[PDB]
Symmetry: D2
Subunit: 365 residues, 4 copies
């Protein structure tokens, strides 16, 4: 396993901020893969998944290149506030690190017309080069870029080089879930993840969108001019359970599912079949946020990853300040049938604190 | 002066979160005004400006109603982290409190068509009622709304009721500046603020935009159908110097400038002239952010509100870890001529930390 | 039945007062008085659930002594968030632990004793209590003022000083149920439903229990040095009821049932409530050890809280993706001595020196 | 100037925590010196002081060794919360980095009796070796030590090796002041510092105390057996103005004061005279903390380092929530005549927030 380090920033006291990049060289015509974990500092299980995946890959026949970037945001990973990693956003500005990726601005209609005389492979190579160069340009600005933008664009440049991008995250108190763009709903069949969110061709600041939107858009533009190029990049986001947790056995299960997808895509020569299990989904627009309608102390009743019906108890809300009044213990209920995916990591909420995220209008994939 | 209290939230231990609303009734046909301060918790000087304005208003003849909401975000105001106020964003999620306002989704073209028969005043009354009603609809949701969204929508509902909205902020280490929509560039000459950013018809989550975007879009639609309605609301954001400070004399000067605008608008009967001083403008697109190109300890040389040249030293960057190498003390310079408006409030930066914001292509108003 | 009053403990910059709800059940008898508080550490919310369940139960018992309960005892800490966690343990401005702000009475107890020794036991005790209550008032009446945390602690303390029994309800981070019990009342552990007890000495270290018992224990010592037996006339125990950032009403019922056994034992309630049968272990406080990370990294916790282990047992796996391909990629850290891990760090990522576990060593059955 | 790095810790993502140690070798018999800065993360001016000192030291004739340790707490230096450095205490535990030093437990009376047959220099050498070894023993513990304790003891071990220890800090919003032990009141005359706190032989967790307490106790014990050994180490703490600030020219003034002390002690051969200026002192017991008696917004009126009377206004307390009542704006005053040294860095306080520290019963040195 070839390893190098990639510089992503620098701290006030002088210390460089760098990432370890592990590379497995493929011997064949299989697709290239880029995997990263822990952009969100508290979401550490992704590192254990990378560890297990690399241990497994050491016994497979790699047909395509694989690059793996654990510990992808040291500034967030190393940031504590109390006994909790404050790792989700820049502590100075509040900007979510996974909202700092680069939306390629250029006109794809024009880019396509200017390259439409090239054959598919040549055109694809040129498009990839244009994205990599756009990242370089962005970082070359004399006014500079934000701390998180430098990190994200640096990761993005590496991701753009691959045919397949897997971004490993975790939820707070959460079940395993997956984000797939609508064009590759089938990907969910190979991972070992029970709930999938199908997402549209829209850039919203995150790595997966940053990676797929240019290619999905190029595919549509090409087809609109009678050329069926196809979407040439896969980019998926795996939300592997809960944050602030390392569970090596569970990480192995996640890694086994990833291998099934890698086998399916021809990255590895061996046939690795998907885990037989039920897989459900919902379209992103039906993924709902449930906010505390009143403040108070919270006992979570809705178990993550378990379907619930409209009006079922989601939490008990306890109010010691209201003892004997009639409202010291109340039940907050789920508005619509759905599956609670994740809940707030703390037991005390203000009015409006996000208590849960719930997939509604869920279907079997 | 009538005092009222408006609830905006509730804390886990049981206390309600509420705001003081001071209302002066006008005796006449003057425009109505809504003024708030301290939505960003550290930006406390706005409270002193409200204090001084109310003290002054007691000696003027009010022709229009004025509502004043100091201490507009107690959750942010009361949030300390070390010896400073962590007041800019929700500490749980990182979302800027001034990015939680509501962009009205309804079709203004259709709305206009359905009300085009009304005269100006009734059409304005109808539109205003619609905006107020949409805020109410937003807060009534079984899935709830964020802590910051409840606060923002509550403030916005009050703001929508006024003809003039003044949002009082401060910068970090900053000179006095003003955000003014392009449709009322004339406003800038009445306030006592040397630098003004002229901003376009675009919603970006903030109060001023929330208040003016619907009316500006309405004006455009009306005009397209041959009706020159005009933009019937004014909404301006005053960035009154630096955060984490109360300066009552300085606040009086700010209040006097506000009074000049209110006099100009016929809110008060008396003639209060603008303070004589030079005033400059800049289109929003030319307001640039300068990020640290390297980490280190900063001596700030560019003074806020003082024009400078690209060749001038902006900061000295000290690196004790590089003593003896030639890199221990380096000078940073801005890529372009301009006027630094504000700079970072700390002397320690990581690579990418936003060091200054700078108005470029400045012109005299 | 229950009377509620509010007690002011501070004020916020924007104007809102900081206040506590104080619930009181009046006793109809000669039983001892009891003062119970919870959630002085903001993240330690289970104590509210314990107070809730206890009050629901108490409504059906016969009270011989007064019981005052103070849930939500620190709204400034309780309401303080940082990320998806309550930054509730210390003043966020200064770092000072809210449970290190209590008042150590400085007056000379030997001299106070000599000046009141002619009094009978009950009159001497009443006088001592009055002195403690007055000393708290004097502390808060200072033109230079006092810290935010000291004002809170001293307000709680003055209430606590009025009772015969003080129960401070806490939680650990990821923790089993444990109890702090002063050496002079080792028997108390036999009544609660708590498997592990730390026996603590006569020493003031800034906390409520110490603040409550040190003056009385010292007074008993002074009286005994003169051949007069007064006894330690106040009981002050700290219950660490599981993990923080959690409300578990069923588990809180169990805790409340144990507290009731102690109250029956002390004659606060008329009814017989016998202790839950279970093995109960203890160790002296000096044998309660802090295990710090020897190296930074990602941690998988192997030592389960409340489960005895040996030195040869794995405490955690330490995972280092930055060291992949070397022997340091994944290592096992082990405890240096046999003991019982009580609690561990609430996060999976540690720096060198981060406190990984607290472990009772030299444990014995009580 | 020789430079080496000293390991003090390690972060979660794997990065080492190290300090740059700059060493100037002495040639002769002059006392040795240990200088450190920025143990408290926000107190960055000490770095500028060290930078100036090192530039100056390259031209002086050194008779004793000098070690300088700027950037002495990278974990605290690099920690941000909003636009400020949360650098005073461990963000996990709240423990002040400058309360983590080691109080040597060993019986000095016994130690002295076991070495009383040794002459002064042999005894001094042995006592120093004992202190250094106790630090090593502390760090060699299978149960480990806290993050802050490892740092503090590492710094302390280096400090113990020197004859003169200078710990460079800053206050929040503060004038320049000095902590000087009662046994060397004469040292204060040399520094360029107007206000000095004379401190007793008491260990409170801080570097200076950690460095001097053993030697001061040893002097007491020696003297009690008819041997006037004297206190063989000098340990002073300079609070060099305000935090979150780099001012190079002002740092130069501080460095020159330091060099006057060093010249006075014979560390450098050249005569560097102290700056003429009035110098005052105060015994530590008379340094008082003034806390907010009520919450609110604060305008600081008491200027740091300027004597005041109990009848003078210290702050205006502004309460917008109490407008229209006598409590809308009130004046808080100093209970006793004194010199305000430092005040709170923010303008919004809760009841009990420490507003000022004030030296009372001040005398000219």
């Amino acid at each position: 396993v070839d390893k190098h380090e990639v510089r992503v920033g620098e701290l006030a006291a002088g210390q460089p901020l760098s990432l370890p990049v592990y590379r497995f060289k493929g011997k064949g015509a299989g697709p290239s893969v880029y995997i990263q974990a822990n952009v969100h500092g508290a979401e550490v299980q992704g590192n254990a998944v990378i560890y297990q995946l690399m241990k497994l890959l050491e016994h497979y026949e790699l047909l395509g290149d694989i690059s793996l970037v654990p510990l992808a945001n040291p500034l967030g990973i190393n940031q504590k506030s109390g006994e909790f990693t404050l790792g989700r956003f820049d502590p100075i500005t509040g900007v979510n690190w996974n909202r700092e990726y680069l939306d390629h601005g250029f006109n794809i209609e024009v880019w396509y017309q200017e390259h439409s005389h090239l054959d598919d492979d040549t055109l694809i190579t040129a498009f990839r080069a244009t994205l990599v160069e756009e990242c370089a340009r962005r970082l070359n600005n004399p006014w500079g870029v934000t701390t998180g933008h430098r990190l994200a664009v640096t990761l993005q440049s590496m991701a753009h080089r691959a045919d397949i991008v897997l971004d490993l995250h975790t939820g707070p108190k959460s079940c395993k879930h997956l984000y797939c763009p609508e064009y590759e709903r089938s990907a969910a069949q190979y991972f070992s993840i029970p709930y999938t969110l199908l997402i549209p061709n829209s850039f919203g600041g995150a790595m997966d969108e940053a990676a797929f939107v240019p290619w999905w858009t190029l595919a549509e533009v090409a087809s609109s001019h009678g050329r069926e190029l196809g979407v040439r990049v896969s980019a998926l986001t795996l939300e592997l359970g809960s944050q602030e947790r390392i569970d090596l056995d569970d990480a192995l299960e996640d890694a086994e599912g990833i291998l099934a997808y890698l086998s399916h895509r021809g990255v590895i020569a061996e046939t690795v079949l998907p885990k037989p299990m039920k897989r459900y989904g919902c379209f992103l627009k039906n993924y709902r946020k449930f906010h505390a309608p009143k403040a108070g102390m919270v006992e979570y009743l809705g178990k993550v990853g378990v379907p619930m019906k409209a009006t079922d108890p989601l939490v008990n809300l306890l109010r010691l300040d209201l003892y004997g009044t009639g409202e010291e213990l109340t039940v907050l209920r789920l508005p619509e049938d759905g599956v609670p995916i994740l809940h707030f990591a703390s037991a005390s909420v203000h009015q409006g604190t996000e208590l849960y995220k719930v997939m509604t209008k869920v279907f079997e994939l």
